[PDB]
Amino acid sequence: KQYSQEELKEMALVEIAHELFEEHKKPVPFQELLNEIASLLGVKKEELGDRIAQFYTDLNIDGRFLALSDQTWGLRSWY
Amino acid sequence: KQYSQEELKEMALVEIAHELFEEHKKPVPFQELLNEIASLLGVKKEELGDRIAQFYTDLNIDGRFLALSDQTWGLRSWY
Numbered sequence: 722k723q724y725s726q727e728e729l730k731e732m733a734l735v736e737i738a739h740e741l742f743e744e745h746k747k748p749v750p751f752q753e754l755l756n757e758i759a760s761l762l763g764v765k766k767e768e769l770g771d772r773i774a775q776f777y778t779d780l781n782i783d784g785r786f787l788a789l790s791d792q793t794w795g796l797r798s799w800y
Numbered sequence: 801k802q803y804s805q806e807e808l809k810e811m812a813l814v815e816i817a818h819e820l821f822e823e824h825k826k827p828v829p830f831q832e833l834l835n836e837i838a839s840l841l842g843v844k845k846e847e848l849g850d851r852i853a854q855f856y857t858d859l860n861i862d863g864r865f866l867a868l869s870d871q872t873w874g875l876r877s878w879y
Protein backbone atom coordinates (compact mmCIF):
# COMPACT_ATOMS: atom_id res chain seq x y z
CA LYS A 722 0.00 0.00 0.00
CA GLN A 723 0.80 3.63 -0.40
CA TYR A 724 -0.81 4.63 2.90
CA SER A 725 0.38 4.67 6.46
CA GLN A 726 -1.92 3.78 9.33
CA GLU A 727 -2.08 7.56 10.01
CA GLU A 728 -3.24 8.37 6.46
CA LEU A 729 -5.78 5.51 6.66
CA LYS A 730 -6.89 7.01 9.96
CA GLU A 731 -7.83 10.18 8.02
CA MET A 732 -9.87 8.34 5.26
CA ALA A 733 -13.52 7.38 4.94
CA LEU A 734 -13.91 3.65 5.54
CA VAL A 735 -15.17 3.48 1.89
CA GLU A 736 -11.86 4.87 0.54
CA ILE A 737 -9.96 2.35 2.67
CA ALA A 738 -12.25 -0.39 1.34
CA HIS A 739 -11.58 0.81 -2.24
CA GLU A 740 -7.78 0.49 -1.85
CA LEU A 741 -8.27 -2.96 -0.32
CA PHE A 742 -10.23 -4.07 -3.39
CA GLU A 743 -7.65 -2.56 -5.74
CA GLU A 744 -4.90 -4.54 -3.92
CA HIS A 745 -6.84 -7.74 -3.14
CA LYS A 746 -8.74 -7.78 -6.48
CA LYS A 747 -11.32 -10.28 -5.01
CA PRO A 748 -14.95 -9.94 -3.93
CA VAL A 749 -15.13 -9.82 -0.09
CA PRO A 750 -17.94 -10.26 2.50
CA PHE A 751 -18.82 -7.02 4.15
CA GLN A 752 -17.70 -8.37 7.56
CA GLU A 753 -14.29 -9.37 6.24
CA LEU A 754 -13.82 -5.88 4.91
CA LEU A 755 -14.57 -4.57 8.38
CA ASN A 756 -11.90 -6.84 9.82
CA GLU A 757 -9.21 -5.96 7.28
CA ILE A 758 -10.03 -2.26 7.70
CA ALA A 759 -10.06 -2.48 11.51
CA SER A 760 -6.69 -4.23 11.47
CA LEU A 761 -5.15 -1.60 9.20
CA LEU A 762 -6.13 1.07 11.70
CA GLY A 763 -5.04 -1.10 14.63
CA VAL A 764 -8.37 -0.95 16.42
CA LYS A 765 -10.98 -3.52 17.22
CA LYS A 766 -13.81 -3.80 14.71
CA GLU A 767 -16.12 -3.13 17.63
CA GLU A 768 -14.58 0.41 17.82
CA LEU A 769 -15.57 1.43 14.24
CA GLY A 770 -19.07 1.54 15.70
CA ASP A 771 -20.94 4.50 14.23
CA ARG A 772 -18.76 4.39 11.08
CA ILE A 773 -20.33 0.95 10.23
CA ALA A 774 -23.79 2.05 8.98
CA GLN A 775 -22.02 5.01 7.41
CA PHE A 776 -19.77 2.54 5.50
CA TYR A 777 -22.66 0.29 4.50
CA THR A 778 -24.42 3.33 3.16
CA ASP A 779 -21.44 4.72 1.28
CA LEU A 780 -20.83 1.44 -0.46
CA ASN A 781 -24.45 1.59 -1.67
CA ILE A 782 -24.18 5.27 -2.73
CA ASP A 783 -20.80 5.17 -4.45
CA GLY A 784 -20.93 3.87 -8.06
CA ARG A 785 -17.56 2.11 -7.96
CA PHE A 786 -19.10 -0.70 -5.82
CA LEU A 787 -21.42 -3.47 -6.57
CA ALA A 788 -23.40 -5.61 -4.23
CA LEU A 789 -22.96 -9.03 -5.87
CA SER A 790 -25.59 -11.78 -5.52
CA ASP A 791 -22.97 -14.38 -4.79
CA GLN A 792 -23.62 -16.25 -1.51
CA THR A 793 -21.27 -16.09 1.49
CA TRP A 794 -20.67 -19.42 3.17
CA GLY A 795 -19.00 -20.57 6.37
CA LEU A 796 -18.84 -23.37 8.95
CA ARG A 797 -21.56 -23.71 11.57
CA SER A 798 -18.88 -24.27 14.23
CA TRP A 799 -17.79 -20.60 13.96
CA TYR A 800 -21.19 -19.30 15.09
CA LYS B 801 -3.02 -29.57 3.23
CA GLN B 802 -2.97 -33.27 3.70
CA TYR B 803 -4.28 -34.00 0.19
CA SER B 804 -2.64 -34.31 -3.18
CA GLN B 805 -4.33 -33.04 -6.32
CA GLU B 806 -5.09 -36.73 -7.06
CA GLU B 807 -6.86 -37.27 -3.71
CA LEU B 808 -8.76 -33.99 -4.21
CA LYS B 809 -9.68 -35.30 -7.65
CA GLU B 810 -11.45 -38.20 -5.90
CA MET B 811 -13.47 -35.99 -3.42
CA ALA B 812 -16.88 -34.36 -3.58
CA LEU B 813 -16.49 -30.63 -4.18
CA VAL B 814 -18.18 -30.18 -0.74
CA GLU B 815 -15.39 -32.14 1.03
CA ILE B 816 -12.79 -30.05 -0.79
CA ALA B 817 -14.69 -26.91 0.26
CA HIS B 818 -14.74 -28.17 3.88
CA GLU B 819 -10.93 -28.57 4.01
CA LEU B 820 -10.55 -25.11 2.47
CA PHE B 821 -12.67 -23.61 5.26
CA GLU B 822 -10.76 -25.55 7.92
CA GLU B 823 -7.47 -24.15 6.52
CA HIS B 824 -8.65 -20.65 5.52
CA LYS B 825 -10.94 -20.21 8.58
CA LYS B 826 -12.80 -17.29 6.80
CA PRO B 827 -16.24 -16.96 5.23
CA VAL B 828 -15.92 -17.09 1.41
CA PRO B 829 -18.22 -16.17 -1.53
CA PHE B 830 -19.46 -19.21 -3.33
CA GLN B 831 -17.65 -18.14 -6.54
CA GLU B 832 -14.33 -17.77 -4.76
CA LEU B 833 -14.71 -21.28 -3.42
CA LEU B 834 -15.21 -22.47 -6.98
CA ASN B 835 -11.99 -20.75 -8.02
CA GLU B 836 -9.89 -22.09 -5.14
CA ILE B 837 -11.31 -25.57 -5.72
CA ALA B 838 -10.79 -25.40 -9.50
CA SER B 839 -7.19 -24.31 -8.98
CA LEU B 840 -6.48 -27.15 -6.56
CA LEU B 841 -7.60 -29.63 -9.19
CA GLY B 842 -5.74 -27.73 -11.93
CA VAL B 843 -8.77 -27.28 -14.16
CA LYS B 844 -10.71 -24.28 -15.26
CA LYS B 845 -13.75 -23.45 -13.15
CA GLU B 846 -15.73 -23.71 -16.37
CA GLU B 847 -14.88 -27.48 -16.40
CA LEU B 848 -16.51 -28.25 -13.00
CA GLY B 849 -19.74 -27.72 -14.92
CA ASP B 850 -22.31 -30.26 -13.75
CA ARG B 851 -20.60 -30.53 -10.34
CA ILE B 852 -21.60 -26.84 -9.66
CA ALA B 853 -25.34 -27.26 -8.90
CA GLN B 854 -24.38 -30.48 -7.14
CA PHE B 855 -21.98 -28.44 -4.92
CA TYR B 856 -24.52 -25.68 -4.29
CA THR B 857 -26.97 -28.33 -3.24
CA ASP B 858 -24.58 -30.22 -0.99
CA LEU B 859 -23.62 -27.09 0.86
CA ASN B 860 -27.33 -26.55 1.56
CA ILE B 861 -27.90 -30.20 2.61
CA ASP B 862 -24.83 -30.71 4.77
CA GLY B 863 -25.20 -29.36 8.34
CA ARG B 864 -21.57 -28.26 8.72
CA PHE B 865 -22.26 -25.24 6.43
CA LEU B 866 -24.10 -22.08 6.89
CA ALA B 867 -25.31 -19.64 4.34
CA LEU B 868 -24.47 -16.34 6.06
CA SER B 869 -26.47 -13.15 5.39
CA ASP B 870 -23.34 -11.09 5.06
CA GLN B 871 -23.18 -9.18 1.75
CA THR B 872 -20.51 -9.82 -0.91
CA TRP B 873 -19.08 -6.67 -2.45
CA GLY B 874 -16.81 -5.90 -5.38
CA LEU B 875 -15.78 -3.21 -7.88
CA ARG B 876 -18.02 -2.40 -10.84
CA SER B 877 -14.94 -2.39 -13.11
CA TRP B 878 -14.60 -6.19 -12.74
CA TYR B 879 -18.00 -6.85 -14.33
Ligand code: NI
Nearest residue numbers: 780781783786
Ligand atom coordinates in the same frame (compact mmCIF):
# COMPACT_ATOMS: atom_id res chain seq x y z
NI1 NI C 1 -22.95 1.12 -5.09
Ligand code: NI
Nearest residue numbers: 859860862865
Ligand atom coordinates in the same frame (compact mmCIF):
# COMPACT_ATOMS: atom_id res chain seq x y z
NI1 NI D 1 -26.24 -26.32 5.16
